[PDB]
Design an enzyme around this catalytic site. Sequence first.
Site, PDB file in Angstrom:
ATOM      1  N   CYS A 181       3.689   2.040   9.203  1.00  0.00           N
ATOM      2  CA  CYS A 181       3.660   0.804   8.554  1.00  0.00           C
ATOM      3  C   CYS A 181       4.842   0.307   7.951  1.00  0.00           C
ATOM      4  CB  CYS A 181       2.469   1.344   7.502  1.00  0.00           C
ATOM      5  SG  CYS A 181       0.896   0.831   8.073  1.00  0.00           S
ATOM      6  N   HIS A 232       0.700  -1.313  -0.095  1.00  0.00           N
ATOM      7  CA  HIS A 232       0.067  -0.060   0.115  1.00  0.00           C
ATOM      8  C   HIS A 232       0.819   1.358  -0.130  1.00  0.00           C
ATOM      9  CE1 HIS A 232       0.009  -0.731   4.363  1.00  0.00           C
ATOM     10  NE2 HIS A 232      -0.062   0.879   4.422  1.00  0.00           N
ATOM     11  N   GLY A 274       2.536   6.577  10.001  1.00  0.00           N
ATOM     12  CA  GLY A 274       3.706   6.338   9.645  1.00  0.00           C
ATOM     13  C   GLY A 274       4.393   5.283  10.020  1.00  0.00           C
TER      14      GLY A 274
END
EC number: 3.4.19.12
Lengths: 307, 303
Positions: B147, B43, B145
């Site tokens: 991820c 993503h 942030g």
Amino acid sequence: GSSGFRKMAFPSGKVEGCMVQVTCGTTTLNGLWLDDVVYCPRHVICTSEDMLNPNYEDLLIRKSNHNFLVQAGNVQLRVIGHSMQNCVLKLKVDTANPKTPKYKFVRIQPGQTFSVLACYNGSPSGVYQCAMRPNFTIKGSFLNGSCGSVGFNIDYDCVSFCYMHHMELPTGVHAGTDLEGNFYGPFVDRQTAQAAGTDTTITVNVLAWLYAAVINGDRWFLNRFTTTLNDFNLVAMKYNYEPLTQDHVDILGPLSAQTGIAVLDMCASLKELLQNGMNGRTILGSALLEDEFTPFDVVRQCSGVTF
Amino acid sequence: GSSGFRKMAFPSGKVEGCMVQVTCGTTTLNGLWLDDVVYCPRHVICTSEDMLNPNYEDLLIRKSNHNFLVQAGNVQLRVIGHSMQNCVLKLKVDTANPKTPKYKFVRIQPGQTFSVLACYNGSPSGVYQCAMRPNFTIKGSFLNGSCGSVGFNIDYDCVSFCYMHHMELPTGVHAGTDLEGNFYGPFVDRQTAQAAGTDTTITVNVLAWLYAAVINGDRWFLNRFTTTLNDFNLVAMKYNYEPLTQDHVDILGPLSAQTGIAVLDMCASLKELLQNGMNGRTILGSALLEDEFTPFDVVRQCS
């Protein structure tokens, strides 16, 4: 609508690169290699018999540089001088650690927290947060061989070393020195009778953790009341909590600012929790009131500070 | 006569040396740089609007290698290929990471623990232990942030990576994938309604923690009774505990060996704690029965 909040240690890589092992005779413990000096507990020089009544100045001058075997990983470092600063040995070595972080030696105050890098034979085993308790002990996890493991904070761009491990008291709590070799608390590096004093709960940290719960959407315990500092302290004294001071109210300021909840309002919520209990509920997953987060620990975690 | 027992994360340095930042357009997250590959959540290629209903194959065909800005520190790493494996993107870079540790990718089981290195913009914020819950979530601390932050165990000098962070559910628990990009649990990498399912307590871990208490001299709760496996499970089921099987009994063997207390004897002590509660007492500093330590976590700490 809640979010997670955890007891979070600092990343340990900068400190791992400084851990070495120091062997003198049959005793091996951990040292901290910064530039061309290795710092370690001076009791590395003692036999078990020595520890009963050590004359450290005499025992140190009896040692030669060759008596100290220092290993960084698989590389032997050569000691070229040995001196003592209080309870810390300084071993000058002929090579400098190329991975020395920007660092400071600091002495922390009771109630403040730090991360411990537990090490054995110069190799790191694990990392966790501790608070300096009001009785100058820490609730750590240290086995035989952990002496010389260090505690630290990372403050912007700098590793601030504040603790070096020396002993486990009979109640299973731990004591040690700053990196200048001065003990926290009234402890001494010898096998003589010493015991932890009575401890108390760090009130300012409990309040910071209640703010962390509100910030993270776990706010069932908030009430509509407010109190005064003196009235709150009347309650604190009945539950073995440290008196709350104006300096503590001040350091909670940033958390009060972010939530819009005044410190003395949160004191009224804490007062009700102490007097009536947790109502069969948890706060941030805990069934007891947590006292090992400082106000800055909350800001650091909620803001995602990196290093 | 007691000794300390703490939730202890693995030292993070081996993993810190692998963390990079990956930016695609305005989306920046963390990546893991091993050999000449950077692994990150797929993503990273989504805008906020793409996330509502992404088709990753079509979004990825629209990207060039240039669209991926990878930075290790402030050193840009040139991307020379990009491929997708389940929910993970693999970016081939022109330089092998000199700090690559010996590593494996492992898919962990519910009840197993690992350390999380929470990172933002490819830099580390902190380290803590998590257990994979029976409902395939973890109770972590992750902000926007985070991820691409990873979870791992270290066995000597071999890093077993087992988790890559993807999402925070509305109850404040967390979900993600293994390093082959397969989610733990029924979750999907889309901004669509998903919720944690009902959880249960990890029985084998509660027992390991009670052994840890005994080993460390906090043993007030130990009774002198024993129970059968089936009788224990009949009680623990009523408290939302997972069934204890013979496989779990075997994994508790090292702790039973060191204490000389049979597992079914510990089950009888746990049964009593479930019936009666603690009554204002704590075990190892806790007023709840702790289920986030595995048997090996105990052995690793006490040895």
